[PDB]
Amino acid sequence: ERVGEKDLRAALEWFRSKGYLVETNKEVNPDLEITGLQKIFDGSLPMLFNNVKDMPHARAITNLFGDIRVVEELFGWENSLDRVKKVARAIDHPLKPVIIGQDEAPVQEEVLTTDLDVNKWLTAIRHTPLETEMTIGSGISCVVGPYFDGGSHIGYNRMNFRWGNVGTFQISPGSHMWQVMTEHYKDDEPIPLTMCFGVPPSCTYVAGAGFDYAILPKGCDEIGIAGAIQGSPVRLVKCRTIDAYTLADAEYVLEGYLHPRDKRYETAESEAADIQGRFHFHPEWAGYMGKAYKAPTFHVTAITMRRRESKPIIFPLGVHTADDANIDTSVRESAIFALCERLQPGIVQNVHIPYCMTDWGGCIIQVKKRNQIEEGWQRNFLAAILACSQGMRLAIAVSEDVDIYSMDDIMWCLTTRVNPQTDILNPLPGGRGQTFMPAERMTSGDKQWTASNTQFEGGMGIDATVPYGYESDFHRPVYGVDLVKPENFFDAKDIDKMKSRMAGWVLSLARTGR
Amino acid sequence: ERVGEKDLRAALEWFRSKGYLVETNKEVNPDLEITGLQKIFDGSLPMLFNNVKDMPHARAITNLFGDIRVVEELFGWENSLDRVKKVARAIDHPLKPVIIGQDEAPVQEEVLTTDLDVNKWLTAIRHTPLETEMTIGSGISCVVGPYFDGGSHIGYNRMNFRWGNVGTFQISPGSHMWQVMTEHYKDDEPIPLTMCFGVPPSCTYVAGAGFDYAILPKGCDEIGIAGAIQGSPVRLVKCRTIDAYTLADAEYVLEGYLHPRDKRYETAESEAADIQGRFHFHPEWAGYMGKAYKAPTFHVTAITMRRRESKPIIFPLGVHTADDANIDTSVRESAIFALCERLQPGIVQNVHIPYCMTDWGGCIIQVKKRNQIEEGWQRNFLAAILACSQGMRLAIAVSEDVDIYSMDDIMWCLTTRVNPQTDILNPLPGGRGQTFMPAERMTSGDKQWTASNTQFEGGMGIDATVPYGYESDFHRPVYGVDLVKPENFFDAKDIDKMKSRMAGWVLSLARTGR
């Protein structure tokens, strides 16, 4: 029982074969060093640390999804558009997970039912020097079967184990875990779930999804979507101490129960002062320094893992990195594309959630109007995206003559193609927002800065598309960059010099001559 | 009379000494090849073409201001902020131009008072294959003395000489030339002016300015500002056939008279169909394909130039390039900074007009609120900038923890720091706009698409700053990128690989660890 099928170790072997893996044997400190090195090489190749300070049994990998190109190469996609379309198709066609025996699951080689000190086995890290606690943010929640209406859910939840085998469990209001906890908020028994660490890359990719429940509602099969993404079923295994299932090919597994009504503070400082929304926790998805809140507790009852001599791998990652941004926004883009295609097929050409747009904060859709009867569909798309993606603050629609991956080109569209009196939608003022946005959280006023007091401003949908029938007046003409060859005029040396001095919007403008 | 003092040739020598000059002897075609090569290397080093097709007496340089770094090095500035502050100081302290004798002016070595075929001596170019005419867009208008209220004006004006020695003269409504023509629209005598070609780089830098007349009103000394920028007075010389002055150190000079009431069409096609706003002319500053209009005529009476064996240099440049963008937006940024400093000193920290913002289209100001009594000044600044910069469509204010040069960071500020119900200003709906913006020009409806029928939407001022006293809640925390050294963990080879895979917002985030 020591082989993961399409597991993280196979991905590491593939990275090493492609030359995309950077290893080191120097001992890395989980306190400020892993996240520091990840931010120094933000959006770069994966880094594998063989020696982690005070964790002789663990290896740490980071920047696994830092470069979207290497991720697309790992999953067999040509480019971002191909990835979006293939992931939408996978969302509509899940692969049912397969259950294997308890004696052939690689993640159950070692089963600790006592001596449950999570902080001794799972690597907790500190992101910034301003933090006080070391937290665990590498595990994905896994709920399979009756508690998810016969489907399966996988997603990240940050945990702070400050009571040995009991830690806080951060749940986004409105998410799948929030819906499960709300349905069972007044039950007598706790919710049995497991946290998986070092899972297969497809499971991480699908766990990044969130707040796309018009496409992935409660009862869907997220593990099935991961299996369809990886081209084969994901293996499940029955837990040892609870009635649930786990990812058999993970590296660590925490079995336990979620107590919805047993809420405790995430940090000792906030627990002392007894207020939420202040007292920094660590950097969050909106790009701001974090805050600490009360949260339900996760009561661990068993710690399963691979053979400790094999040094099971854990994937710790800073929040404000290209890694986390890719992990969330990839399936977010695919789900937004699927929704727009459901509403009216053939109009949306591409969807992109750039790193700068705060994974749950905004998105960009590219629409192509084929005739006069399709004019106005971009506004329906913007309203539907803002309403079906809770707390999304800025959705932008652009035409097909726009480079959706260049923020400079988007800014140009905003400057030249937006009528400020009619092209700025504010669909749902007073709806549900995201508490982690400081602009929204500051609307609490003098109340507790939690989700119960914030007041959403309604989002912002910007229609920066060209009106149909005015494509000649809004034409970005072309420069003749294909009609002349620089080799006829200069030598290779000068051409390389001039090319090396180029960066930014000019790279996009020179490719298209636009 | 054959030495320009701080002239274009001295700048070429400096570029060659610094290794920033790329030369070639292959004959370049002014039709689609110069602009094509400039767009292939957009924002790169200057290119000098020694042989121009059908112009055996002329040399052509392009991308002279393509790289703002080489421009700042040429003028002796450390960075863009230093450039902005120094240029504001120069705006407030002009150097009076000096007049030299007619026999020592390098630009008057050859004086052609007959055989005035402008197209035979001045290199006209075609930008895109969609155009029909070859136009002259390398000369700057120069009005000195009584017709500019004792001051001096320099600025670009595109000319199409389709009547031998008479060509159209494109004038922006509201500009300095527009104000001069409006003051003398009903005079009997024409307006005597000269067009200078291959002028000193400081004169090009100052001619790029426009629509900043709260700082550079009619009657100012723009040539004095150029002299102050270059650190020495600009030399003037009395014209030969008219009562005016010219830049003595230019390469070509066209003396003549501007006939405000003698308006003709810019292209034969639009003249035939007899409509304006259609019938493409060439790419304009807003990044769109151009249109042709009626315009006053410039009646040339003499063509002065340097010795034709010296091959005088001409500076043709495509409109939608980093070159033109720098040329305009540099002094635009300095003037906006000066205005904001006049209104309330010490609040604005930096001003930037990115390439993506359509030189007259938008700007970004960075404000730092020092106390509670300064909260709200960013809105005064935005309103004043939108009102005193005619036709500006999008002004954005950001806080001091923002990278003003990264469009991704600006998009992040837009996503997380903008209240759509209170932070989007629309100050002056129905005011004066820019006819060359298609979004504005399409408001003409069924009328002629000219400046007489467009209806401005009012501009858009976005207050994306952090409210004072909430700097802890809007804190972009920091990652510990200075506390760990990658050399201790990896070798130089892997570090260079990981660094080479990085580009875009990650370069800004990794420098600040933010």
Ligand SMILES: CC(C)(COP(=O)(O)OP(=O)(O)OC[C@H]1O[C@@H](n2cnc3c(N)ncnc32)[C@H](O)[C@H]1OP(=O)(O)O)[C@@H](O)C(=O)NCCC(=O)NCCSC(=O)c1ccccc1C#N
């Ligand atoms: C809002 C909440 C939780 C509430 O807590 P509070 O505002 O303090 O109010 P409350 O809970 O005490 O009272 C409430 C009363 O409503 C009844 N009630 C309460 N809940 C339920 C329920 N589920 N079902 C049925 N009834 C319920 C109770 O009956 C009664 O409560 P009880 O009397 O029973 O105790 C509040 O604490 C709170 O955490 N905000 C913040 C939570 C939040 O944004 N995370 C987002 C996580 S994204 C994230 O990280 C991330 C994502 C991507 C990338 C990086 C990162 C990072 N890095």
Ligand SMILES: CC(C)(COP(=O)(O)OP(=O)(O)OC[C@H]1O[C@@H](n2cnc3c(N)ncnc32)[C@H](O)[C@H]1OP(=O)(O)O)[C@@H](O)C(=O)NCCC(=O)NCCSC(=O)c1ccccc1C#N
């Ligand atoms: C609007 C206009 C000119 C008017 O023309 P029209 O709309 O057709 O109306 P109109 O002139 O025939 O009539 C008008 C009537 O108002 C009276 N009147 C008219 N003018 C005056 C005056 N100055 N003073 C006193 N009275 C005056 C006349 O008394 C009567 O005219 P008359 O009867 O006497 O003839 C119209 O033609 C027109 O060109 N729009 C477009 C012009 C325009 O945006 N360029 C912007 C140039 S930025 C540029 O390139 C650029 C910049 C940076 C980087 C790259 C690039 C590029 N690449």
Ligand SMILES: [Ca+2]
């Ligand atoms: Ca993305």
Ligand SMILES: [Ca+2]
């Ligand atoms: Ca600029």
Ligand SMILES: [Fe+3]
């Ligand atoms: Fe889920």
Ligand SMILES: [Fe+3]
């Ligand atoms: Fe629009």
Ligand SMILES: [Fe+3]
């Ligand atoms: Fe002027």
Ligand SMILES: [Fe+3]
């Ligand atoms: Fe604001």
Ligand SMILES: [K+]
């Ligand atoms: K998920």
Ligand SMILES: [K+]
């Ligand atoms: K000027």
